[PDB]
Paper text:
One element of this ATP requirement is enforced by the nonessential U2 snRNP protein Cus2 (human homolog Tat-SF1), because splicing extracts from Cus2-depleted cells can form pre-spliceosomes in the absence of ATP. UHMs adopt an RNA recognition motif (RRM)-like fold but have diverged in ways such that they no longer bind RNA, but rather interact with ULMs. Here, we show that Cus2 contains a conserved UHM (U2AF homology motif) that binds Hsh155, the yeast homolog of human SF3b1, through a conserved ULM (U2AF ligand motif).
To view in detail, the interaction between the Hsh155 ULM and one of its binding partner UHMs, we determined a 2.0 Å resolution structure of Tat-SF1 bound to the Hsh155 ULM (residues 98–112). Considering its high binding affinity for the Hsh155 ULM and sequence similarity (55%) to the Cus2 UHM, the Tat-SF1 UHM offers a readily crystallized model system for studying Cus2 UHM-Hsh155 ULM interactions. The Hsh155 ULM is bound to the characteristic α-helical surface of the Tat-SF1 UHM and has well-defined electron density. The positions of the characteristic UHM and ULM residues are conserved. In a similar manner as T296-P297 of the SF3b1 ULM4, the C-terminal K104 of the Hsh155 ULM is stacked against the Tat-SF1 W336 side chain. These consistent conformations of the Hsh155 ULM and SF3b1 ULM4 suggest that an extended interface between the C-terminal ULM residues and the “RXF” motif is a shared feature of the Tat-SF1 and Cus2 UHM. A nearby Cus2 aspartate (D201) is likely to account for the additional arginine (R95) at the N-terminus of the Hsh155 ULM, which is disordered in the Tat-SF1-bound structure. The structure of the UHM of Tat-SF1 and the ULM of Hsh155 suggests several features that could explain the higher binding affinity of the Hsh155-Cus2 interaction compared to SF3b1–Tat-SF1 complexes, including (i) an intermolecular Cus2 D254–Hsh155 R100 salt bridge as opposed to the intramolecular SF3b1 interaction (e.g. ULM4 E295–R292), (ii) cation-π stacking and hydrogen bond formation between Hsh155 K104 and Cus2 Y252, and (iii) additional salt bridges between Cus2 D201/D204 and Hsh155 R95. Altogether, we conclude that the ULM of Hsh155 binds to the Tat-SF1 UHM in the characteristic fashion observed for other examples of this protein interaction motif, and the structural similarity between Tat-SF1 and Cus2 provides a detailed model for the molecular basis of Cus2 UHM binding to the ULM of Hsh155.
Residue numbers in the entry:
A (entry chain A): 260 to 353
B (entry chain B): 99 to 104
Write the structure that this text describes.
């Protein structure tokens, strides 16, 4: 019944990364937006910058866009971290 | 960018 458009990306960072460089957070935000814009129209992009698992959520216009994003990003490397990407479970908050 | 840095 739910056609999932929201992708949850994990291990993109650790919140300590933002302790001693105030610019890293927005650099990461835009890195993600630039990459994800190739997968579909982005409706909302959020970084949970105090979440210990390094979490981001990207919501797309179409569920096929979320699928393409998940296919391309899961297991990819970002700043020395191997990230995961999965469809939102519809219930967990970050 | 940080994309793909291992
Ligand atoms: Cl946004
Ligand atoms: Cl539209």
């Amino acid at each position: 019944m739910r056609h999932e458009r929201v992708v949850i990306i994990k291990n993109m960072f650790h919140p300590m990364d933002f302790e001693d460089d105030p610019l890293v957070l927005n650099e990461i935000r835009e890195d993600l937006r630039v990459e994800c814009s190739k997968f579909g129209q982005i409706r909302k992009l959020l970084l949970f910058d105090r979440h210990p698992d390094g979490v981001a959520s990207v919501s797309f216009r179409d569920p096929e866009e979320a699928d393409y994003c998940i296919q391309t990003l899961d297991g990819r490397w970002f700043g020395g971290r191997q990230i995961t990407a999965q469809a939102w479970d519809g219930t967990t908050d970050y | 960018s940080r994309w793909d840095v291992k």
